[PDB]
Every structure is written in structure tokens, then in C-alpha cells.
């Protein structure tokens, strides 16, 4: 889930 939430998309 770092893909989704380690940056703001």
C-alpha cells in the first residue's frame, strides 16, 4: 500500500 499512499495521488 506504499504505492498508493507514500505520495498523494
Amino acid at each position, epitope marked *: 500500500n506504499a504505492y498508493n499512499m507514500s*505520495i498523494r495521488r
Partner: antibody
Amino acid sequence: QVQLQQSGDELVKPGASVKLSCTVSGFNIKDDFIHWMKQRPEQGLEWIGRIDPANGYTKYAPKFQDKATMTADTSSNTAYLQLSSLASEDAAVYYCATYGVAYWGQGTLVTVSA
Amino acid sequence: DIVLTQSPASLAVSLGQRATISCKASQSVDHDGDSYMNWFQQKPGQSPKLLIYAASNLESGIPARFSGSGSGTDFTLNIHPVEEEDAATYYCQQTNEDPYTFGGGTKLEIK
């Protein structure tokens, strides 16, 4: 399974340009932005920008807008950082990252000669 | 742009004790009920390693000795207990607004 393999260290002359690479394996780069970071021991970590390899769209931090050019090639699964008009303050370790910003390359050292 | 200020700049901690590192953002890094603050660990010669994302999520592969708290402008990384291998420099990073920015780092030593 995801590996970001960065190119070897470079000694560069003032005024020149250099192009660094970030070869990704275990991940299709069309699937996410690639980010570039700069690190100096005194000034610390800075985000240069990100590129979307699927469409070539780029976003830079203002301080890197006339220094860095990010490109990418999905076919070779490689991203590039070109640094222009090199000066002493460009000597640094440069990192690429993806999967949000979870996975990082090992860094490429750029040294600038006198 | 968002400025991140870490506290302390360095600390020495006894093996087995708790440690906290603080990161304060000059403006909020919240959006839609989430807080876009990451924590990284770096050892010399190595790339930064992601510990915590979106303030409180533990990254896969990272021991549960590490945890994150906070929202808005005020964040903390907690290490419980500290172990020998934790000697490193720790950075916060916000990814809520462009350009992303990093704190100045906190160097942890084990005494």
C-alpha cells in the same frame, strides 16, 4: 523483486553536461512515476521532480527547472536524468525512486573537478 | 513550499530504551483525511530506506519496533526498543504538495 540499478559514478567538468540512468527490473515503469532526488552532506535531500513514463509528462521543483531534464523509455524500462551547465553545487549523490517513493536506486555519485 | 524541521538534530540513546524523533511542517500536509508524511532511515553509503508512510503505516519488511504518529503539522517517529542496528540518520519527507520536501535529518547513535 523490484530493482532500480543506477549508472556508475561520474567525474564531470564545470560547464559540461552529464546524463545519469536508472534501469528498472521487476516492474513496468509505465506503471508509476519515477522520482529523482539529490543529496549533499550539508544541504541534505532535495526532490528534483517526477516523470510519468507512460506519457512523458514531467513536473520539476522550481530550483531544478533550468538544471535537470528527466526522460524515460518504457521499452528499455530506463529513466534518465540529464544535468546541464555543471557547477560545484551540482556535486552530489543522485537517486531514482518509484512505487510511490518506496523503492530507491543505489545512488550515482557526481563529482565536479576544478 | 513546505519546510520540515526535525528535533533533535542528533541523539545518543541507551540500548533497549525508547526514542522519539519529531518532524514539524510549516503548513499542513493533510488531504482528504490522510497525512502525507514519510519516514526514512539511511546508513552511510546506502540509499534511504522507507520505514513509515502516510504518517502511521509500517512499510513491509520493517520491524514493528518502528511506529509513526501525528497529523496536520506535527509528526513523530518512535523506536521501541532501540537496537544496535538502529544507528543511522532518520529523515521525514512530505509528499502532499509539490515540490516534495525533506527534513534536515536526525542522527541516532547507540551509547
